């Protein structure tokens, strides 16, 4: 149902 | 870990350690789930058994557990193939164990341990003891360089501060045990006591050191009887972390404020609250001092106020993310010493030298397009000798 994109949903930091 | 420590020991010391029954029980307890059964099986048996039989007593499912436990016990040298009977001393000694042959304390342990931490940081009000000072300095987490002047904290000393009290204490004992042999103290005597505690001159000195850390307490002018504390056998949070890089530390202790002040700027001080801001200048200083970002997030994570616990993640992601970026920002340039080779006229031989460098494990980076590579100076002579040989 129009879920948020991956970058907004979960951290994109390598650490 | 404790089992880790026993594995890194010689067979001679291990058999000596397997003395009074309490030790065998203590080493037995850490057998994960499987080997405990195996120990009971071949306990009344005086005749060695084939290694194949042990392998086939565990179903194909969860087979990896069969091997890992076996490797652990082989490391502990509990049994020997004898071609798998247990150690005659362990079997006998264990059989002795197996039917053969308070509120004040915790406060004392917390306070006495705290004063050691107070001394760790530049706290003027901390317990002073020449033996303790050299112990920490020789423990690899502090350095003086001038006996007259108080010692400072090393790079590893700051990290040790942030570690949780259980791991903070255990690491200290682990370092203490290793240095006990160097200073001339028998490792078996102290190590055996720790196990017996979980339930001579060397011990008297060792017991005094344990009393200093607050793990044990005689309470009777150093009588023969001692009363171990909770920490000797082996808490709600107070920090509120905001999305705007603000820490409100509900602390009365000067130590915790000293800890939080390591990686944040203290703004205001209140009896049950201290306002700290995690400025990049502070965190970069904390990272420069030696701290690792994961510790900072972990240190704030563990001492998290109950109100933040319901939220998930308890630490707002931007704060955790931002701290990491502050850490990663410093190390943008990865300096790496090496020796560069250029003017590779022999293009065909360049690959051969590339293969030779790879085989030796000296090559760090290479560029086939530009026909160049970098090798650490340690292996520079080896490649230089290879080139000279032709």
């Amino acid at each position: 149902a129009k879920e948020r994109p991956i970058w907004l949903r979960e951290s994109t930091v390598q650490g | 870990n404790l089992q880790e420590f026993l594995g890194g020991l010689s067979p001679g010391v291990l058999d000596r350690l397997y003395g009074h029954p309490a030790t065998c029980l203590a080493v037995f307890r850490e057998l994960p789930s499987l080997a405990k059964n195996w120990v009971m099986r071949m306990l009344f048996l005086e005749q060695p058994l084939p290694q194949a039989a042990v392998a086939l007593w565990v179903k194909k499912e969860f087979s990896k557990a069969q091997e890992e436990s076996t490797g652990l016990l082989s490391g502990l040298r509990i049994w020997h193939t004898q071609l798998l009977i247990l150690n005659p001393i362990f079997r006998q000694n264990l059989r002795i164990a197996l039917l053969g042959g308070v509120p004040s304390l915790d406060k004392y342990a917390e306070e006495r341990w705290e004063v050691v931490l107070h001394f760790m940081v530049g706290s003027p009000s901390a317990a002073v003891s020449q033996d303790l000072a050299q112990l920490l300095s020789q423990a690899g987490l502090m350095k003086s360089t001038e006996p007259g002047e108080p010692p400072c904290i090393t790079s590893a000393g700051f990290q040790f501060l942030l570690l949780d009290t259980p791991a903070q204490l255990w690491y200290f004992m682990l370092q203490y045990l290793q240095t006990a042999q160097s200073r001339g103290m028998d490792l078996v005597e102290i190590l055996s006591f720790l196990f017996q505690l979980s339930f001579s001159d060397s011990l008297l000195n060792f017991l005094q050191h344990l009393r200093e850390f607050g793990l044990v307490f005689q309470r009777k002018r150093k009588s023969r009887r001692y009363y171990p504390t909770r920490l000797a056998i082996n808490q709600p949070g107070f920090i509120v972390v905001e999305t705007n890089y603000r820490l409100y530390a509900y602390t009365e202790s000067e130590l915790q404020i000293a800890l939080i002040a390591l990686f944040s700027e203290m703004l205001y001080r209140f009896p049950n609250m201290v306002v700290a801001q995690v400025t990049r200048e502070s965190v970069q200083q904390a990272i420069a001092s030696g701290i690792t970002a994961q510790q900072i997030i972990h240190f704030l994570r563990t001492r998290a106020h109950p109100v933040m616990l319901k939220q998930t993640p308890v630490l707002p992601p931007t704060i955790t993310d931002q701290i990491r970026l502050w850490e990663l920002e410093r190390d943008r340039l990865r300096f790496t010493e090496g020796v560069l080779y250029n003017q590779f006229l022999s293009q065909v031989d360049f690959e051969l030298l590339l293969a030779h460098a790879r085989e030796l494990g000296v090559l760090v980076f290479e560029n086939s397009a530009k026909r160049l590579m970098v090798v650490t100076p340690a292996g520079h002579s080896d490649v230089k000798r290879f080139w000279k040989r032709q």
């Binding site: - | 037995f28 307890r29 059964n37 557990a65 002795i96 164990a97 039917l99």
Partner: protein, 263 residues
């Protein structure tokens, strides 16, 4: 953690017959095997608790709720209470010729409720996996089938295992119990070597029993017999009131007194 429970069948008539027979196997050794078996369990981990229960033709009594010998101090207390308690029970007892068969369902009933009493006490943080290591040593009693059958279902509902370790006689009813509740069964023929069976087959807990090879289950003959004869019957007739297996067609079943109507 695990709450082991050793329901030893300390039947004086049977164990006494062994003394008269002067056989190598004796009750004192059996209690020692139970004792050593009990010590090893607690010895596995601190959190573990156990209990021991005896059986007699009269009544069954719990055998269980410095280091002079050098063993662990806690195990020292357990040995003292069990050693003294069993001797009192065996030495002191009345005589009743009418009742001579060992009782086991009653002893188990004291065991099943003990876990529930102990299950309430244990804190919510720690989940408990209790077990009953029934060690039968005598033939079953005919009149105790219904009573024994209720306890077994109570165990299954509460998920307590019954690892029967019967010896000297294969109890047809007991071997039925261990199957229903998932418990193990074992008919040890080398009574002097009884303990080594325990440390191997029964000692490992349920969470670890699966990841281990153990003797395969024995065939269980779920025999049904008529109430006229007590002979095995494959096709049984029952009524919706008595729920009673009956031999053949009757106008009315006696146990019911119902005005059954033909059709």
């Amino acid at each position: 953690l695990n709450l082991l429970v050793i329901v030893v069948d300390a039947n004086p008539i049977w164990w006494g017959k062994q003394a008269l027979k002067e056989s190598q196997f004796t009750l004192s050794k059996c209690i020692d095997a139970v004792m050593v078996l009990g010590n090893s369990h607690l010895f596995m981990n601190r959190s573990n608790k156990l209990a021991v229960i005896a059986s007699h033709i009269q009544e069954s009594r719990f055998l269980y709720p410095g280091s002079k010998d050098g063993k662990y101090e806690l195990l020292t207390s357990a040995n003292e209470v069990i050693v003294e308690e069993i001797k009192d029970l065996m030495t002191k007892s009345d005589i009743k010729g009418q009742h001579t068969e060992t009782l086991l369902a009653g002893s188990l009933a004291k065991a099943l409720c003990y876990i529930h009493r102990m299950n309430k006490e244990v804190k919510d943080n720690q989940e408990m996996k209790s077990r009953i290591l029934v060690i039968k040593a005598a033939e079953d009693s005919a009149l105790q089938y219904m009573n024994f059958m209720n306890v077994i279902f109570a165990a299954q509902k509460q998920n307590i295992l019954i690892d029967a370790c019967v010896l000297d006689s294969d109890s047809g009813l007991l071997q039925q119990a261990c199957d229903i509740t998932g418990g193990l069964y074992l008919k040890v023929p080398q009574m002097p070597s009884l303990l080594q069976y325990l440390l191997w087959v029964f000692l490992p807990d349920q969470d670890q029993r699966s990841q281990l090879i153990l003797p395969p289950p024995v065939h269980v003959d779920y025999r049904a017999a008529c109430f006229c004869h007590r002979n095995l019957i494959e096709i049984g007739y029952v009524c919706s009131v008595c729920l009673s297996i009956f031999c053949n067609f009757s106008p009315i079943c006696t146990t019911c007194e119902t005005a059954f109507k033909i059709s």
